[PDB]
Amino acid sequence: KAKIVLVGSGMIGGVMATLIVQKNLGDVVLFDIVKNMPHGKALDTSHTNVMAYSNCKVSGSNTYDDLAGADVVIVTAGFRDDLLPLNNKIMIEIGGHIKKNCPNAFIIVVTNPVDVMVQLLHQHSGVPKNKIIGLGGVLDTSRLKYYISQKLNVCPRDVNAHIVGAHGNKMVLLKRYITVGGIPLQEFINNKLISDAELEAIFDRTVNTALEIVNLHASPYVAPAAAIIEMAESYLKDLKKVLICSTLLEGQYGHSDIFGGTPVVLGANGVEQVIELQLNSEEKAKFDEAIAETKRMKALAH
Amino acid sequence: KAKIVLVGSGMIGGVMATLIVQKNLGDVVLFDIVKNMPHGKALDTSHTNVMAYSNCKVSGSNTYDDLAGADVVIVTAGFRDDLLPLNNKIMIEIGGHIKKNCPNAFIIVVTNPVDVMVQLLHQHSGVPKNKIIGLGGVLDTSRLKYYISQKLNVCPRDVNAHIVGAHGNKMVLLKRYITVGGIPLQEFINNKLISDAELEAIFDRTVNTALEIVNLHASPYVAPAAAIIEMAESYLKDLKKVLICSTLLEGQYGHSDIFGGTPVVLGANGVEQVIELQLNSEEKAKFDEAIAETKRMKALAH
Amino acid sequence: KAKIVLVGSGMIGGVMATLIVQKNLGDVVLFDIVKNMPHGKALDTSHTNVMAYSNCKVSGSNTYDDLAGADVVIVTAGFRDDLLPLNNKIMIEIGGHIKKNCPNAFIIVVTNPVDVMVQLLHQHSGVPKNKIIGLGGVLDTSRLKYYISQKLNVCPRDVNAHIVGAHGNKMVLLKRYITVGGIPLQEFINNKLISDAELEAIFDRTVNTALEIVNLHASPYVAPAAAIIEMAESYLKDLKKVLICSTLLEGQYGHSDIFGGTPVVLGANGVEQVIELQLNSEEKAKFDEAIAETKRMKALAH
Amino acid sequence: KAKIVLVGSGMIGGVMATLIVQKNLGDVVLFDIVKNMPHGKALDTSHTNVMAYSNCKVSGSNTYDDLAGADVVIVTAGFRDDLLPLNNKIMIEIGGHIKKNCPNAFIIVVTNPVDVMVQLLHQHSGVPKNKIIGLGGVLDTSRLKYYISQKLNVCPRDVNAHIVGAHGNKMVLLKRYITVGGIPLQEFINNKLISDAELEAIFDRTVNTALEIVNLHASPYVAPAAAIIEMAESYLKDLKKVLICSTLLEGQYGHSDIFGGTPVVLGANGVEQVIELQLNSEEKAKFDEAIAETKRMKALAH
Ligand SMILES: NC(=O)C1=CN([C@@H]2O[C@H](COP(=O)(O)OP(=O)(O)OC[C@H]3O[C@@H](n4cnc5c(N)ncnc54)[C@H](O)[C@@H]3O)[C@@H](O)[C@H]2O)C=CC1
Ligand SMILES: NC(=O)C1=CN([C@@H]2O[C@H](COP(=O)(O)OP(=O)(O)OC[C@H]3O[C@@H](n4cnc5c(N)ncnc54)[C@H](O)[C@@H]3O)[C@@H](O)[C@H]2O)C=CC1
Ligand SMILES: NC(=O)C1=CN([C@@H]2O[C@H](COP(=O)(O)OP(=O)(O)OC[C@H]3O[C@@H](n4cnc5c(N)ncnc54)[C@H](O)[C@@H]3O)[C@@H](O)[C@H]2O)C=CC1
Ligand SMILES: NC(=O)C1=CN([C@@H]2O[C@H](COP(=O)(O)OP(=O)(O)OC[C@H]3O[C@@H](n4cnc5c(N)ncnc54)[C@H](O)[C@@H]3O)[C@@H](O)[C@H]2O)C=CC1
């Protein structure tokens, strides 16, 4: 079986462990710096193997060397711009341990701001560029897809959409790349099934969804976890899904030496393909704004 | 639980019963005119409830009144243009029994030529237009999607495509409506990841797939069954999937008083939406050719 | 689709909503008395329909009349013996609203001490005895089954076991009723694959598991949620699983007028069968101790 | 991904390929000696990746060297006692190719009489004893479990039962080892929920089920396929299920140098445990009769 190490056993970590057992995806280590909490979560979660018909070990850890043997490492560890150097130090520490203990693992970074943190961990861990990605577009687009599906009264997964550049407030929502059952969304607009003004409000809701959830006295963690597991599952099972993730750009969109959100194909070799959308000049200008903000924050991270 | 009656317990019927138990979708009746064969298939299939963790009854029947209580009726019963009046007589007979025993059932017609047979059964059963559809586009597009996915090395379901008008040799393969991970296929052509000539060969392979399978000394029945169950499941579970099926046209594409293939939304109310693609004049001319052939065959069916 | 109302949107409520969407079981209402928190959790969870390929609405509520239309109601609402009258008052309030708004719903009670609270809600809601059960044995036995499976290196679900009488410290762990792959556990003891002393330590661990998790700075909520969803799913899908739950006793084990834990069969009619284990006199004496403690606490609840 | 080679692409082979794609278990090769038929079945089945959300290659083969790289090999190839030397010759041929091309594969033998054929293939292939098993008990017990579940109105999987010794007419149906929800069946008999006479009729039905299906003008192949896939899945996913299979006996039950049916644990190391039921002297005498018949037939196979 695969060994999946969750570096960070907080809110997202707990849901990931739950879903991994539900899906029987592999053995799980809940790693954290907080003493014994991961052992407690692991114990609770382990019992769900019975209900789920699964056979995944779930263990807790406070010991970095339990990274040894990991096939997948998912980094949610962390805790304004003031946090950037603190979370950088966490990425440095984790990277040194990945390099030593599991240099061949597939790495998914979640810690915000993710497009910065994923590149910092790439640098500190030394893993190949096809073996480390960041969460962003699967989550952001799940929101956009879902909101459109409820307006159009269709199955949520039948809406497809692209959000690129970065996770966070500069995300680029590409109206031209929305489809419903594979059909351009513009046909539905033309038929007055959804209006341009409705879509503008949905776009703004998508950008502000994390804030909306926080203002309702909750935290966004279940959908982030589910998005991460969709990514990890595509790797583990060699599904070769097209999923939008933060990945190293090497000239796509006119950008290099930086990570940003774009469709990729995830399978057994990691990032098997980086797909470059054929953006028009106006869309590219928005992409550039997203990259500029990643670069601004990266400079502050040290 | 739902009661699903398979009117026709041949090759497609057997796989449908298998998949219904796998998915725990409902109780199954394998109905046929052949004596005892459906009882034998039902007995074999019923044991798979243990392996599948399901609880679906599977029974055989030679008695039409076992249609009573059906929530879903799937018609594969049947056996050149010479067959048209013989299969019409089968649709007449089945329709009379549906009208009497299960007028509120959701009906899926499979018997070829499906766009003719579905309308004949609509007429003979009296069910509402939102409660009867024919298999076509889910199956035809599964082939197109699959062949493209193997060229592009992506997950099969991540290719979406539209084939409309009719099932059979006049099916309309809409190049403009192919996407990969929600991205227009033309971007992949522009990047020389797949060529126009490759796609032409894939289109011809799609049209001729049933013949290809027969020439390899096999029969097309597993994918037809899986396509039908995808449709039935969307109804039973109120998924509201966008699925291309044969449905009554009431002016879409300039056509009325005939069934043809188009995207529809399938949920608990049956056909909840008929989606009309905004075809251009050249695509519409191909659609017209498909309808004309359905009409030609319908006239021969009596 | 089914409508599932989670009366209580805390830790267990959140995981239940997650699992319901994963399993596409029905629309979900997260109801709570805390303002807006359920709306926030509902919003986060709703996005997972995309990742899960599901179509379940997830809404929050602070309005009791949203119980109207519920097919299943799961009660986790609540917050030593000092709490008994406070949680009784919560059961009274919920019961009045169930009686008015959804008297035909299937009710699962979770609030501790569950064997007391389930009967109080039965009394206050007026629902039939086959339509209300309490969580206990599925959860307690998941722990016992799991711990044994890890010693014997077998699939967790292949261990079966019975814990009866009550949830909590007087639970009756029935050594005679443990099997592995359907084989009596005693054969494995005879073969020195597990010893009697190992099993004694596992029994004590099972009884004290909730305390163990709390002492590790965690809370038991994921496995409780999964156990509840196994119960709810058996009802919704008419699986007729044998599951140990708290149910009204009408003479079984020599007890009436009280709820206690025993195997039941859960299907579309609710509790379709109450199974009475043929306990020996010594096992019965332990059962009596469990009932006595439920009665002691019920008297304090008012 | 795993590579699963189906040596034999007939009735059972076709269903296995269908189920492997449904479960996304691995790439599939349909191998047969019949020209092109496996290619045709493979082509049909491959399209179901779209409906199933899977990514399994399905190919046909007439070339034995396509065994190279196989992780799992499932042998259904074959076609009274007169057939024994003909099917032996098929096992010899297959064994030579396994030894050359995939000596590290996990092998499941199905060809009848399975307890003879599995040992012949063990001998001819040279694989280790923990890496080759025969289908029998999962299938025979699925029938027994199912029939009892329908009498008792419980979920089929909640009945557990043991049938040992051999597949075929000398199978040993162990009344003492039947449970319902983990409870001895005798408690249900004592409660007059099922009688001893009913169980005798169910036992006879179980022994004669293949004949019953054939006499109904059908063939037993769907449940055999599902049983085989349950076994293969337990290996591939390291589930460590307890499953009754034909395996090499090394003194269990007083028998050596022969294969017979007994519970085993199947996981990533193949047969991880052989479980010896603690049979009484009368049960052992029936076990001996089953082994004697395997030995009689093996002698005739050459
Ligand atoms: N990329 C995206 O789309 C999203 C990113 N996020 C980010 O994900 C991160 C995690 O979010 P939650 O799980 O909700 O937070 P959380 O606060 O519940 O969990 C973070 C955990 O990291 C642990 N931690 C701190 N230093 C560590 C170290 N060196 N090694 C291991 N563990 C360590 C903490 O003790 C804590 O348990 C945050 O940075 C958040 O902003 C959240 C949602 C979406
Ligand atoms: N719409 C589509 O995309 C496709 C349609 N088809 C069509 O589906 C149909 C079924 O195909 P298979 O299952 O492979 O054929 P099959 O020949 O195996 O099964 C047809 C069954 O219908 C039964 N039957 C005849 N009259 C009947 C009656 N009055 N009531 C009930 N059963 C009756 C037969 O005895 C036979 O068992 C054929 O018409 C075939 O051309 C096949 C593949 C795809
Ligand atoms: N039966 C069993 O096996 C188990 C029972 N439990 C019990 O389950 C209950 C819930 O546990 P958690 O979810 O972890 O607790 P929690 O404290 O996270 O959630 C309880 C929720 O109930 C809400 N609430 C209070 N009064 C309410 C009302 N009138 N209507 C609706 N909501 C109301 C609270 O605001 C809170 O959000 C507790 O009583 C706990 O002891 C926990 C585990 C196992
Ligand atoms: N162990 C058990 O519980 C059960 C065993 N069986 C046995 O399973 C076997 C298969 O049954 P079905 O699939 O229904 O039969 P089938 O006749 O449909 O398929 C057998 C296939 O083996 C092929 N074959 C013959 N020689 C071959 C070779 N050297 N290499 C590869 N393929 C070759 C044939 O061409 C045919 O396609 C039979 O021996 C049957 O008695 C069937 C049911 C249960």
Numbering used by the authors:
A (entry chain A), B (entry chain A), C (entry chain A), D (entry chain A): 3 to 81, 94 to 316
Show the paper's wording.
LDH and MDH are homologous, 2-ketoacid oxidoreductases that share both a protein fold and a common catalytic mechanism. Both enzymes are found in central metabolism: MDH catalyzes the interconversion of oxaloacetate and malate in the citric acid cycle, and LDH converts pyruvate to lactate in the final step of anaerobic glycolysis. A key event in the early evolution of the Apicomplexa was the acquisition of a malate dehydrogenase (MDH) via lateral gene transfer from α-proteobacteria. Following a gene duplication event roughly 700–900 Mya, one copy of this MDH evolved a novel substrate specificity to become a highly specific lactate dehydrogenase (LDH) that is now essential to the life cycle of many modern apicomplexans.
We tested the functional importance of residues in the specificity loop in PfLDH with an ‘alanine scan’ by individually mutating each residue in positions 101–108 to an alanine (note Ala103 was mutated to a serine). Mutating Trp107f to Ala reduced pyruvate activity by five orders of magnitude, whereas mutations at all other positions had effects less than a single order of magnitude, including the canonical specificity residue at position 102. The Trp107fAla mutation affects both kcat (1500-fold decrease) and Km (50-fold increase). To assess the effects of Trp107fAla mutation on the specificity loop conformation, we solved the crystal structure of PfLDH-W107fA (1.1 Å ) in the presence of oxamate and NADH. The protein crystallizes in the same space group as the wild-type PfLDH, with nearly identical cell dimensions. In the W107fA mutant, the specificity loop is disordered between residues Thr101 and Arg109, as is often seen in structures in which the loop is in the open conformation. In the mutant, residues 112–115 are in a linear α-helical conformation, in contrast to the wild-type PfLDH closed state which has a very prominent 60° kink in the α-helix at Pro114. Thus, the only significant difference between the wild-type and mutant structures is that the PfLDH-W107fA specificity loop is found in the open conformation, consistent with weaker binding of substrate. These results indicate that Trp107f is necessary for pyruvate activity in apicomplexan LDHs, and that it has become the new ‘specificity residue’ despite the fact that Trp107f does not align in sequence with the canonical specificity residue at position 102. Mutagenesis within the insertion indicates that only a single position, Trp107f, contributes strongly to pyruvate activity and specificity.
